[PDB]
């Protein structure tokens, strides 16, 4: 199943909900111990990790350096070592059982730093920084390379993407996207990096484009039904799901699913409540 953790509707949320694309049901589990939005979700060793984000509440607006681990059989959260810095609107990828925490903001500081967590030592350590400061950055791993895609540097929203090589600790700019995208959903479906939606500084986007490594080319595919930024995104059974987000007026509950063979989007699900800025992952 695909778990969504955190999110935001009037305040940051502690929801942990699981969607069944087979039954179409929603299964609700333990609350996050601290509410979080603008966080990222991943899975390592079947354990679900929630990374960074922020607690935007009626009494505060605290950027999170926290990393928290959910175990699907135990149904319980456990704190892990926290990152060097708080990272709101962070991006994360998984390579060789390690957690990469990418960019994000703390206050008005927009990070270019990246750090790496290893679950069996419970430690973070900094690696080479990106060439660009990026919050709202989409992150993906393909051929066990780490891609940071789009985002916002504090001033400009970005269509650039860069690649991190683990065995040299270096970042390389790649071909930029056709569209400037901050707060897009970025994943690796089959073997292209997919960037769906986001915000270009004036409009939320429903366009989706994908990066083909062999040709270093971005190509437009089926555009999403409903424009959305700050969306959750994951791949289930070889097809992509995008959950929630913001369209400039309302917090979406819509969940869309992309079939890569037909190249078609349409509405699969409502979340139990509309929200943006969730962390999504599958186990």
């Amino acid at each position: 199943l695909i778990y969504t953790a955190g999110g935001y509707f009037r305040q940051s949320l502690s929801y942990l909900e699981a969607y069944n694309p087979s039954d179409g049901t929603w299964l609700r589990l333990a609350d996050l111990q601290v509410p979080r939005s603008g966080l990222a979700g991943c899975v390592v060793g079947g354990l679900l990790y929630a990374v960074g984000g922020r607690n935007n509440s009626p009494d505060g607006n605290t950027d999170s350096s926290a990393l928290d681990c959910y175990n699907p059989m135990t149904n319980q959260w456990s704190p892990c070592a926290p990152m060097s810095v708080p990272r709101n609107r962070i991006g994360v990828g998984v390579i060789d059982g390690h957690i990469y925490a990418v960019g994000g903001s703390h206050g008005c500081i927009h990070h270019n730093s990246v750090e790496r967590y290893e679950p069996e030592r419970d430690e973070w350590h900094l690696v080479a920084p990106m060439l660009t400061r990026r919050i709202g950055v989409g992150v993906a791993v393909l051929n066990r390379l780490l891609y940071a895609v789009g985002g916002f540097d504090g001033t400009n929203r970005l269509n650039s993407a860069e690649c991190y090589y683990p065995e040299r600790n270096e970042w390389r700019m790649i071909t930029a996207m056709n569209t400037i995208r901050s707060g897009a959903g970025v994943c690796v479906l089959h073997n292209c990096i997919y960037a769906a939606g986001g915000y270009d500084g004036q409009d939320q986007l429903n366009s989706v484009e994908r990066y083909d490594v062999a040709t270093a080319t971005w190509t437009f595919v089926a555009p999403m039904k409903h424009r959305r930024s700050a969306l959750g995104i994951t791949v289930h059974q070889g097809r992509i799901y995008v959950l929630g987000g913001y369209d400039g007026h309302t917090f979406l509950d819509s969940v869309e699913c992309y079939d890569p063979d037909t190249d078609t989007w349409s509405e699969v699900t409502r979340m139990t409540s509309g929200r943006s800025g969730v962390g999504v992952a599958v186990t």
Binding site: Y8, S37, N61, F152, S182, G183, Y199, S229, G277
Partner: peptide, 9 residues
């Protein structure tokens, strides 16, 4: 509201 995330300021 944040134009991108919807979150309050």
């Amino acid at each position: 509201a944040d134009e991108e995330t919807g979150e309050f300021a």
